[PDB]
Sequence to fold (184 residues):
Amino acid sequence: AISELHGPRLLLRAWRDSDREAFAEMCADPQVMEFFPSVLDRAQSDALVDRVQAHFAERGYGPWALELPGEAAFIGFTGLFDVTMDVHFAPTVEIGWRLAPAYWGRGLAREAAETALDFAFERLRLPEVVAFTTPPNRRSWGLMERLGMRRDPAEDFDHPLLAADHPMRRHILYRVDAARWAER
Ligand SMILES: CC(C)(COP(=O)(O)OP(=O)(O)OC[C@H]1O[C@@H](n2cnc3c(N)ncnc32)[C@H](O)[C@@H]1OP(=O)(O)O)[C@@H](O)C(=O)NCCC(=O)NCCS
Ligand SMILES: [Ca+2]
Fold:
């Protein structure tokens, strides 16, 4: 029984088996997956869910499944994931998000992220949370900066889990520390 979190509209909860079909549909959508190397099939979507569930088991937090009580059982994920890869800003905790496209444009990722960052800073009492994306993914880094996260362009980096010559290799880094979060 992991910690569920609430916003005014959203419930951030543990993943359920019944989420897997809806999540696979999202991960097969080229508009959802545009700024990733490819769309995913069901097996790959399920492997991602399994990784998330292992993270929750090990850490007590993770990328929560998003439910919209009064509206929809599952609309995607938003939450925290430990950064352990060989990058300059590791080790730390990242925040990220993936919403079904019918739910974009509503401030729902913003609300989910605010809820997750409140947990990060108030409950976990983390010193900092980061987020990273590619330059063309304006919807994603726009959300980062709207949350109050900030970027130093000198901290751009090549993603180490991508090939050294991969077209999407260059990522940008945003950070928010506990003090900056408290000042809002
Ligand atoms: C990144 C992603 C989660 C952003 O979702 P989003 O809906 O655009 O983000 P927000 O929740 O902040 O909503 C902001 C939009 O809602 C609108 N909005 C409406 N009501 C709002 C409210 N109450 N609060 C905030 N914004 C509101 C804003 O005007 C903005 O619209 P705009 O883009 O047309 O200007 C989504 O595009 C996505 O899932 N992308 C695919 C997966 C992905 O690339 N993930 C990131 C990998 S790094
Ligand atoms: Ca263990």
User: Anything to note?
Assistant: The pocket of coenzyme A (ligand 1) is lined by residues 32, 35, 96-99, 104-110, 133, 137, 139-140, 143, 146 (CB under 6 Å). DSSP finds five helices and nine strands in the chain. Helices lie at 20-27, 42-59, 108-123, 138-146, 178-182.
